[PDB]
Amino acid sequence: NTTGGRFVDKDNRKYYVKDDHKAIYWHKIDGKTYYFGDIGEMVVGWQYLEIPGTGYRDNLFDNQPVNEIGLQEKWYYFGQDGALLEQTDKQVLEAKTSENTGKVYGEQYPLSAEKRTYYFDNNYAVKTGWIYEDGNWYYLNKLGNFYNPLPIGEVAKGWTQDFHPAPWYYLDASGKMLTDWQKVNGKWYYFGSSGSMATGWKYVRGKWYYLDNKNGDMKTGWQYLGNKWYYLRSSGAMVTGWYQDGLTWYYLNAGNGDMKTGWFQVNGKWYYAYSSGALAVNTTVDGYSVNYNGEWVQ
């Protein structure tokens, strides 16, 4: 809704001048959208800018006061003629890098040789968060790595937290979200149906597995958890019943799986495990005899 002015080439910059004042920030001119920053220099290419449409950064000229309101910022793409790319779906564009953002008309820089697919929201900003395409989920970065906004809107690869104990996801080499059991850096992780990395005890397909409570990696062998011992086989699955480690027998509780100590009964017969879990065999324990199977013979 800006009219009556004209574009001007001056001082190796581009301005829009109306009645001898310069356009600043966002303007809708002649069916296209432009942005002229804080002093009037028309921008081109990739730009991380305050969002348009509020009025506070819109239809303003440099003779007018500017509200000190700090608006939210997003990525936008402008053509080399300054016109905003008004995309609401997706488009393959030169990759944004450290060398091709925040430039104004007149500044010399090369377009990126590498092109990437960028996704856009209904208001022409680069989209972030989860998107679905061709049978897969991809995550578009919401934040910079851990201030610089460059990563925002890029396709996440590898281990990625989704911030609103934020959930972990793993995206493969093309960005596809993995589900179910996956081996990453030599260790097993379970991502279920939703993609969220499991932690703690998890019942999957009729067996118990323990994933590290913080890191998600599947444990095997003997594990001391919640003041009790459990034995997990090499596949990760929790064992119940009798288990022989070398010559030594252990009994893992039916159901819960915790290792028994002291006197315990299995199918009518009595057994004694020392504090280590080791079954007493062919000896006595406090007056009671136990045979080669560890059974109490009265």
Ligand X SMILES: C[N+](C)(C)CCO
> Does 264 engage in binding with ligand X (CB under 6 A)?
no
> Does 279 engage in binding with ligand X (CB under 6 A)?
yes
Q: Measured between alpha carbons, how far is 167 from 162 in angstroms, rounded to an integer?
A: 6
- Residues sharing a CB contact under 8 Å with residue 68, sequence separation 6 or more, in sequence order: none
> Does 243 engage in binding with ligand X (CB under 6 A)?
no
Judged by CB under 6 A, the stretch of 4-12, 66-74, 81-89, 287-295 that binds ligand X is: 287-295
> Does 213 engage in binding with ligand X (CB under 6 A)?
no
Partnered with residue 241 across adjacent β-strands are: 252
Rounded to a whole number of angstroms, the minimum distance from the CB of residue 145 to ligand X is: 14
Rank residues 95 and 131 by Cβ distance to ligand X and give the closer one.
131
> Does 284 engage in binding with ligand X (CB under 6 A)?
no
Instruction: Specify whether the backbone of 227 is left (phi greater than 0), alpha (psi in -120 to 50) or beta.
Output: left
Cβ proximity of 118 and 138 under 8 Å: no
Q: List the one residue from 7, 181, 239, 261 that touches ligand X (CB under 6 A).
A: 181
> Does 52 engage in binding with ligand X (CB under 6 A)?
no
> Tokens at residue 263, please?
């006197």
Cβ proximity of 43 and 103 under 8 Å: yes
Rank residues 15 and 208 by Cβ distance to ligand X and give the closer one.
208
Strands 32-35 and 26-29: antiparallel
Q: List the one residue from 216, 232, 252, 273 that touches ligand X (CB under 6 A).
A: 216
> Does 208 engage in binding with ligand X (CB under 6 A)?
yes
Q: Measured between alpha carbons, how far is 43 from 57 in angstroms, rounded to an integer?
A: 15
Closest CA to 41 of 89, 78, 93: 78
Sites of contact with ligand X (CB under 6 A):
130, 137, 159, 168, 177, 181, 188, 194-195, 197, 201, 208, 214-216, 218, 222, 229, 235-236, 238, 242, 249, 256-257, 259, 263, 270, 276-277, 279, 288, 293-294, 296
